[PDB]
Design an enzyme around this catalytic site. Structure first.
Site, PDB file in Angstrom:
ATOM      1  N   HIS A   1      -6.850  -5.712   2.716  1.00  0.00           N
ATOM      2  CA  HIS A   1      -5.906  -4.666   3.058  1.00  0.00           C
ATOM      3  C   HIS A   1      -5.569  -4.688   4.548  1.00  0.00           C
ATOM      4  CE1 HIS A   1      -5.774  -2.316  -0.767  1.00  0.00           C
ATOM      5  NE2 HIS A   1      -6.870  -3.016  -0.990  1.00  0.00           N
TER       6      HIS A   1
ATOM      7  N   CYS B   1       0.853  -1.176   0.000  1.00  0.00           N
ATOM      8  CA  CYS B   1       0.000   0.000   0.000  1.00  0.00           C
ATOM      9  C   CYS B   1       0.901   1.243   0.000  1.00  0.00           C
ATOM     10  CB  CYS B   1      -0.875  -0.017   1.245  1.00  0.00           C
ATOM     11  SG  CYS B   1      -1.873   1.447   1.472  1.00  0.00           S
ATOM     12  N   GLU B   2       0.785   2.093  -1.016  1.00  0.00           N
ATOM     13  CA  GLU B   2       1.619   3.287  -1.069  1.00  0.00           C
ATOM     14  C   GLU B   2       1.228   4.306  -0.014  1.00  0.00           C
ATOM     15  OE1 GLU B   2       1.138   4.946  -5.030  1.00  0.00           O
ATOM     16  OE2 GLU B   2      -0.340   6.426  -4.364  1.00  0.00           O
ATOM     17  N   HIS B   3       0.078   4.117   0.627  1.00  0.00           N
ATOM     18  CA  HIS B   3      -0.383   5.042   1.667  1.00  0.00           C
ATOM     19  C   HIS B   3       0.142   4.778   3.085  1.00  0.00           C
ATOM     20  CE1 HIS B   3      -4.117   6.132  -0.978  1.00  0.00           C
ATOM     21  NE2 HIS B   3      -2.979   6.583  -1.472  1.00  0.00           N
ATOM     22  N   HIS B   4       0.248   3.512   3.488  1.00  0.00           N
ATOM     23  CA  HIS B   4       0.750   3.180   4.823  1.00  0.00           C
ATOM     24  C   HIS B   4       1.976   2.279   4.789  1.00  0.00           C
ATOM     25  CE1 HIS B   4      -3.606   3.906   5.084  1.00  0.00           C
ATOM     26  NE2 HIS B   4      -3.332   4.489   6.237  1.00  0.00           N
TER      27      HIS B   4
ATOM     28  N   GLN C   1      -4.611  -0.395  -5.397  1.00  0.00           N
ATOM     29  CA  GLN C   1      -5.356  -1.446  -6.101  1.00  0.00           C
ATOM     30  C   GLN C   1      -5.963  -1.029  -7.430  1.00  0.00           C
ATOM     31  OE1 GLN C   1      -7.607  -4.087  -3.415  1.00  0.00           O
ATOM     32  NE2 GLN C   1      -8.770  -4.693  -5.247  1.00  0.00           N
TER      33      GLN C   1
ATOM     34  N   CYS D   1      -4.304  -2.768   6.390  1.00  0.00           N
ATOM     35  CA  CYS D   1      -4.428  -1.494   7.083  1.00  0.00           C
ATOM     36  C   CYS D   1      -5.866  -1.317   7.537  1.00  0.00           C
ATOM     37  CB  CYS D   1      -4.062  -0.340   6.161  1.00  0.00           C
ATOM     38  SG  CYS D   1      -5.360  -0.011   4.952  1.00  0.00           S
TER      39      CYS D   1
END
Ligand SMILES: N[C@@H](Cc1ccccc1)C(=O)O
Ligand SMILES: N[C@@H](Cc1ccccc1)C(=O)O
Ligand SMILES: N[C@@H](Cc1ccccc1)C(=O)O
Ligand SMILES: N[C@@H](Cc1ccccc1)C(=O)O
Ligand SMILES: N[C@@H](Cc1ccccc1)C(=O)O
Ligand SMILES: [K+]
Ligand SMILES: [K+]
Ligand SMILES: [K+]
Ligand SMILES: [K+]
Ligand SMILES: [K+]
Lengths: 194, 84, 194, 84, 84, 194, 194, 84, 84, 194, 194, 194, 194
Positions: free
Chosen positions: J154, J85-88, J126, J156
């Site tokens: 996910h 995940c590029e966010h977390h 995704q 997260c």
């Protein structure tokens, strides 16, 4: 004396009349296009459910018992059985699991299946039905041991009681080595387990 | 009998082509070389022909009918013809 | 006239007597330690199975119908139901699935459940039971549509017929948009499917 | 009342054929021998006839109506007729 | 041969466009630059063209045909043309 | 003293008031069209969840205990049960599994089911509930042994705790041969296992 | 005005008193070793179940909405949700399934889950909960369409009603293309189906 | 404004009937007794009437419109009318 | 170029409306204010307009086109227009 | 420029240094017998997870594309995929489903699998990963159409969010006939459905 | 000393920097619209996964330990747990199964759940996590025995190793009678088995 | 020319020789006790896997085609099939589903099974195998239509590729009405679906 | 001497030649567009299946063995494994289950997985593979005991033999306490059972 085809015909009308009475006693018009032949069908059904009375372990017995020089556990599991609760006259459905340690003499499938039908198709109590099947097998084979297990759903707790069709009743009768040797008992329960 | 209904299924470039019902003009049906039958389970007879709908439309014009409307429904292509 | 608590007590004896007759008519001794109280229990049971006659949609109706400004399909599925076969007086057990397109008015769960209980606890025919519940819901809500599907096992084919407890009977009643719009019908069958 | 809508389902070579709604001309309905009913669950009445749509189209021409358009929708075949 | 049927699938702004069956006029087919083939499994030949139906309709007008009706069926768009 | 119908009626209002208070204490307007009858339905529900207090094992007792000369394990499994957490006043749902080695005397299904209902419908602690059902069966039958197992999901860990509806709590009580003989204990767990 | 940490603490005592009242109103002695801290725990629980009132879609909103130039259906399924029935103050548990056709703007998972929590943790009605989540997503993304489906088990029909934990209530809200295009609605139902 | 589009769903013998969009002639809409609304989730307003499409077709003729084409699409029956 | 095809989807009271293919008259497209594009994955360009099909029909009449046929196919509503 | 074995080695130390830093920033002693080699193992892991950056569809391309004169749908389903995940910077795990309508040219399994790995082993979203795999296939085959569907969990939202490992995200990309022909899209979803 | 809210805020920046570094070290542009806030989110995440350091069994302890005079096995199974591998800094997900023979004292669910969380949300080694949870329970209850079983999936073998998400690691710690008595051990494994 | 029993015996040594060479080229000693008879067994196996070349649809054809005046879809599903990947010489295992709309002529099970065996037991490409079986059935029955679907696991992705035995490849061939009529195609996919 | 990267390249051609031979020896034209690169791919594959020869337990050994002061059973189950039947050169696929009683020293997952890979990727006999893995773990840890169970499907009985892909072969090796103490052995088989 074992029930007979004659007895049935000589009693069918009685049954039909009892049911026709009940229909009224409940609030129904026994004359409705769909209730007319009911008293008879209901009666016919109630006789079929109790057709076990017109038979004896003897009718089956010797007809199919073979010598196969076998002395290791034999199991027949997941035998469907249907019966009637002598308490509420509502049926209880389930499965029967049989196992026995032959003393040379083995019992044929059809015969075994007949023994289960003979005692199940009549007014019963799970405990008694389990026991009767076990003794019957014991007498028809003089085995080293025998075990019988019945698991069933009682419709008098599914509809009645509240709403408990989930509930299951398990009973068992262990004679011979199935009673005295824990190992035999465990293996039987393992082989029917799955 | 001014109106006529014909139809074909799945594909238009091939038959069979339905050309009539039980109350269709027997002569016209015969002119088209239409067979008659009642498929098992159905409570009605139908007249059919092995030709592609396009061929049946030409023959039908010779007898004075013209195409008023064409529509699809399910997997059935239907032509509504009117005579005079 | 809806059946009543009085009607029961005034009829219980009659039912009890009919069953006591059946017992004998079958070959049993209504005197056995375990068969003594049967005729009464049997009678009480048969009354509970038909306690729906002593009720009407009215009793339920307005008592629980709320305004929630909703106009999209609402579904209640896997509602357990038990009923009696008017043809053999044997029960048929199963599940009821219900769906409807509200016209602002919604139906409370308990009320819905009550509707199902009312028509199922009485002598029935699956096709009929399905339709009655569908209509009962249509009258208690004036919805844009309503659908009902029942899947059940008939004991008169499990024990009787031969041995077919596997068999399942499915019946449905589609009213309103549920009958005319194939898309609504499909979504309804999808949402209860699993 | 210049417009009229009729329809049939599943198959065209057999009825019933729907010929009218609640606000249909009672005389015309009677001329076609159309029955009236309200199917359980529906909030409306409908006039139907046991004849195949083709037969109903012929009768309708005698009363001065002509087919303007024919279309399929779902499993329903629909005809839109206009009088004069 | 007064009637003609053409069609396209999925999308109208692109071909192929089906322009004829086995009994189609060979000259007209040639004029449209239509190829012929029999798809595996099918018991019939078909004439197709790589042009969008709109282009085929213009060419067809030049040869004297006019669109009488257009309808959808399945994922197939169909045009019914009549000459003179 | 066992709670009674009178006690309820005389307390219903008190409950309704407490709930109507809570509604406010949380932020809601007890007047909203859909919240008006809530304080009462909430109180009614809370009484139905604890209706076990208005009963005693006696009411059940002798009413249904038969002699079937049976002395082998009897098991009733998968008995649905619903109870209230005395700690958070949130309910915990699950199943109960019972078994006993009769000393001639057998217990009827309905009676057994009633014993479970009596102690579960009241503020409880799974551990206590398990033991109460066990002792109650021991007292009503003087059996050679008895075993009770409860597996339940506690809602105060599903929603609360974080999100743990997956969690299952298992408790058990083994008396008599069920406690001293490892073999009986194993057969019991095997027979309810599946 | 959104409820706040202050409001809670200033109300906790009132809740604790109300529950302590209920304890008595039922037959219990709020003094028992295990019932002492209950009034407080019950209250804390009842606030955690309704903590959604102390929030607004705004707190979530813009914080997590990313541009990913995506315009095809996105689906988040099997989201666990716990809520409180505003009718009996009994909870209903279940799953939420969301789908939407973005108009370039996508929503982060956490934000999506946060929207679900906000409306579910409060006195609710399934039909209303469904619709609020749908609109909240519509306002936070200006999508081409959005669909929400909730399936839940209502505990006021499990314990109450009779014994119906089997039953399931399915509700849905379809906005935009999800309402008008049968194909999008079908795909959406197919992709969450399994 | 020469063209008009009206439609109904599921069944033709009953309404509602859609008679207009946001840019429809306000007068004509009023003459038909059409209400206006924007269904939640939709990015557009629509004018509807509780009458069956057949009734709306008669009223429309009185104002000078004629049915050019009728077609089905999904569970929607659509009429394309042209004035003069 | 006598024939023209336009279409819309899901709902008729709102656009976009497809007004042309790759071989469409550039001038006519410009007059309608149509944009051009090639959706990812498609092997063709399409001209579209944000107006409802009813609006596009009026504009098209001013340029001399008349609606010959209207049909549904899938979730697509299609109009076949002919000039002169 | 694609990352290379050199870039890695020239960066490992910078990675190991950052992780050794994080260890401290959390409260751990990077010196513990079991944490010593962690900075390097973490770094090595984090590079393996993003090793897709050191590749391009070209490396795969022509190497394995055969002519089989096939023009009917081909589907490869249940392809395991692991991404970040590029966010977390937490991973998301799942399955990829691919289908395409070949224009004579078919793709080799190995190659197809490599395409998935190339884009999944890197920081992702995704929605974007779905689209890159789709276009990559369209470019390496000029097919009549292609469809890709990704379903994933996910992490997260499993650990974080609260406890939602149950939740699943579904994304899809439909190009060509897969986008325009509802029938192809349905068949594709049906054939991967089970 | 237990980590605290202050420590986090004073370290958050240090973590963000370390991740911002790693982003670069891998080939990414820490500036991309979607990678900007990542260093912070990644850091926050990494603190949430290790938040167990800022707690001690004491915080939980006495707060919820009740006297229920119970002395038979108690089991809480299928407890979801998430942890971090101290070797690769990749998380391992799984389930925890706890059982203990109380010596009068019983532990409440919430507290038990809190104990598991405390040791799992920190850098761990499955074998250590299992033993720490077991000793914590032993200290907080002086039980006659206790057993803990953890089954987890390690992502450092799912993605890494090759592709082994199938693999499951099982660890256990048995103290007291759970260690010395094979029968207790077997019953515990049976009861969590299914 | 179809391969024959002579060709084999004349070639078996050639195969055995080749394998004996491979054994060495790998590092093994073709002399070990257990490796001695390997070259021959490996050869015998490779011939068995390709025995399809020594057969033609003709051998089957007319031998079993009966007239039963049937014109409705006939389906034979779940036909196990084993084949060889012409690209790696590794086998791909799976199932074949066949359907066809007969034109009076039907095909017998054995014959159908023999058609599948003929083309699967030879070096293949899944797409080709699907098509050959499809055409073979078309030729042997002049049916209104035929459909074939094959789902299989390719070992060159299980072991090789990485570790993907999870992956499944689905191919289909639809001729005649199975190609042109979406309804027929859907029904076929439904009937083999489960 | 362990096989090496040099050995492979110097033999690849020899393998390719052998396979190109087999192609002819079977009936194929090694010249076909699809069969051209086959001899090389076939050769490449056959070396990957036997790449285990070019390694030794030493390469793995010490690199990852940690001291965790743990002395209770550790189990790693459901480890996927692929191998080659030295008898027919056909692969057999399955799962490996491992357990061991550490003597303070524990093994890392990666290392454990590497041990399995090493002995499985080479011509094997199931009985031997089981034993080599067991001994490898015993040497690398000096544990108090170790257990290894392998269940695999043999492709030379699936396709060959007749059609027996159903059949499974189970082999095991028990060293130390796993051999001598029946109790440990049982627990190990129970913990991997499910
Ligand atoms: N089978 C065509 C429709 C069609 C039916 C009849 C004739 C021609 C075409 C489709 O599904 O697209
Ligand atoms: N039922 C036909 C279509 C049809 C319906 C009604 C009338 C005529 C034809 C089909 O499915 O193809
Ligand atoms: N594929 C279009 C239908 C269509 C077919 C052919 C031409 C134009 C449109 C739809 O599903 O909406
Ligand atoms: N719903 C009808 C078709 C229909 C819809 C709308 C108007 C008229 C007819 C059907 O399914 O056959
Ligand atoms: N979406 C409509 C049909 C429709 C599509 C496009 C334009 C107008 C109407 C239906 O399914 O009923
Ligand atoms: K045809
Ligand atoms: K009809
Ligand atoms: K096209
Ligand atoms: K209508
Ligand atoms: K539109």
């Amino acid at each position: 004396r074992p029930r007979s085809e004659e007895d049935n015909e000589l009693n069918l009308p009685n049954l039909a009349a009892a049911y026709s009475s009940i229909l009224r006693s409940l609030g129904e018009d026994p004359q409705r296009q769909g209730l007319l032949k009911t008293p008879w069908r209901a009666a016919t059904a109630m006789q079929f459910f109790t057709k076990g009375y017109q038979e004896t372990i003897s009718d089956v017995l010797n007809d199919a018992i073979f010598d196969e020089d076998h002395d290791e556990m034999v199991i027949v599991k997941d035998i469907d059985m249907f019966s009637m609760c002598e308490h509420h006259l509502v049926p209880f459905v389930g499965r029967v699991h049989i196992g026995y340690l032959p003393n040379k003499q083995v019992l044929g499938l059809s015969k075994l299946a007949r023994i289960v039908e003979i005692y199940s198709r009549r007014l019963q109590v799970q405990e008694r039905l389990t026991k009767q099947i076990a003794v019957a097998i014991t007498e028809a084979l003089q085995p080293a041991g025998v075990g019988v297990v019945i698991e069933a759903t009682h419709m008098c707790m599914v509809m009645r009681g509240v709403q408990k069709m989930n509930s299951k009743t398990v009973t068992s009768t262990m004679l011979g080595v199935f009673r005295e040797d824990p190992k035999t008992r465990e293996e039987f329960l393992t082989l029917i387990r799955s | 009998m001014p109106y006529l209904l014909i139809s074909t299924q799945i594909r238009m470039e091939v038959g069979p082509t339905m050309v009539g019902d039980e109350h269709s003009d027997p002569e016209l049906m015969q002119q088209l070389g239409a067979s008659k039958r009642r498929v098992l389970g159905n409570n009605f007879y139908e007249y059919y022909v092995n030709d592609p709908p396009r061929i049946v439309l030409d023959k039908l014009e010779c007898r004075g009918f013209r195409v008023l409307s064409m529509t699809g429904v399910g997997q059935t292509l239907v032509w509504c013809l009117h005579k005079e």
